[PDB]
Amino acid sequence: TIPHLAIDPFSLDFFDDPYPDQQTLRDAGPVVYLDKWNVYGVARYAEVHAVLNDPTTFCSSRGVGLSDFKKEKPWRPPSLILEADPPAHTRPRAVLSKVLSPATMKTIRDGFAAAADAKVDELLQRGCIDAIADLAEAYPLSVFPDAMGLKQEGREHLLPYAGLVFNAFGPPNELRQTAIERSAPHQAYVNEQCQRPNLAPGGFGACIHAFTDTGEITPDEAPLLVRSLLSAGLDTTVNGIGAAVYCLARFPGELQRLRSDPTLARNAFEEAVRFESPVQTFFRTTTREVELGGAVIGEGEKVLMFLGSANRDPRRWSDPDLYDITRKTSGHVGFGSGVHMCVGQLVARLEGEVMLSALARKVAAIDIDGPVKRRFNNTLRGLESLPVKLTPA
């Protein structure tokens, strides 16, 4: 009753152009079985949203990658928030929610925006820059590690560690095996920076440790929660900002609308998250036999959610393959949905907004003027290199 497909959603060919194979996954049926990896898959918005919003049935404590923590040892100690289910998930979630709260955004917004304007001003001085290394990577590196409270030493480990993390969610292919092979130095650095003495006062890290005397988390839970932000906090915004600039580079008409009304920056970034879905996929594990889109899934089965496919499902979106900065983007699943919905989405949106605001005010045109190179990762979608000429406004 369930169609079986041979598509490998973690193959290089798939990463290079996933959209045809994603329509094939959506249109084969509401629930497919991927013979390559022995997992169920849902690529339509409706089922992706349902799975995300049934955390009891589709749990996260058995891992949100392919590996089932009940069957294999996790490559690193489980995240106390991402790889936990309610109620164990609840209190750590609240702490991270207050650490990255609306009130917290007000303390960092001015510095984040000044750093965004400064970067655009710097890039305009060069003209022909790499929107990835010189913008999508350079900007978050100039604000987030400092907002964390990290020392300068060792920050080169941050992106390699994040790439390792997101590759580790995937199947045991060469991307994952190679990432884990090289992980030791990056794990050592990250784990060490998670300790209270190594986090500058007032930053996200020290604020997490400060919540250890409320009874929401104990002192021994703080390092792993700092680890969460060092895992999910940087490389995501890199690919989110990169996708936004990529969209504006490909859709000059939308850049011109953004210039005409820079208050659209925040929605232009949200639309970029939907349109590219930098975070492409996550797994759940069934805790019982479940009926999902006419299929009966047994207990202990991995289910692969195609977030990016769900964000382009024409059953849900009008003109899904068009970048539209005035689109009503509420409901897209690029930040997830439900109890695990991205707790750092205010940071992500802040960085995205202030950067697109800088571009909206300072840039008249963004033209690709060089080979576009894609970066391959089992979970992240984004570019390795995006040469562009920036024309001053």
Ligand X SMILES: O=C(O)c1ccc(CCBr)cc1
Q: Is 157 part of any known ligand binding site?
A: no
Cα(93)–Cα(101) distance, integer angstroms? 12
339: left (phi over 0), alpha (psi -120 to 50) or beta: alpha
Q: Which of 373, 357, 326, 300 is CA-nearest to residue 121?
A: 357
Q: Is 89 part of any known ligand binding site?
A: yes
Residues 26-55 binding ligand HEM (CB under 6 A) are none
The four Cα atoms 59, 81, 382, 306 give a dihedral, to 10 degrees, of 10
Beta pairing, strands 128-130 & 281-286: unpaired
Residue whose CB is less far from Cl ion, 165 or 325: 165
Per-residue x/- mask for ligand X, residues 265 to 294, rule CB under 6 A? --------------x---------------
Residue 228 interacts with ligand X (CB under 6 A)?
yes
The count of chain residues that interact with ligand X, using the rule CB under 6 A, is: 10
Per-residue x/- mask for ligand HEM, residues 292 to 331, rule CB under 6 A? ---------------x------------------------
CB of 191 to Cl ion, least distance (A): 5
Say how many C-beta atoms besides its own lie within 10 A of residue 271's C-beta: 25
SS (H, E, C) 321-332: CCCCCCCCCCCC
165 binding partner (options Cl ion, ligand X, ligand HEM, none; Cβ < 5 to 8 Å by kind): ligand X
Binding span for ligand HEM by CB under 6 A among 40-48, 175-183, 336-344, 358-366: 336-344
With CB under 6 A as the contact rule, the residue among 5, 32, 80, 81 that binds ligand HEM is 81
Cα(95)–Cα(324) distance, integer angstroms? 35
Per-residue x/- mask for ligand HEM, residues 337 to 356, rule CB under 6 A? ---x-xxx--xx--------
Would you tell me the crossing angle of helices 184-193 and 222-232 to the nearest 10 degrees?
120
**What are the DSSP E strand ranges found in 145-259?**
none
Residue 11 interacts with Cl ion (CB under 5 A)?
no
Residues forming contacts to ligand X in the complex (CB under 6 A) are: 79, 81-82, 165, 227-228, 231-232, 236, 279
Binding site for heme b, by residue number, is: 89, 93, 284, 340, 342
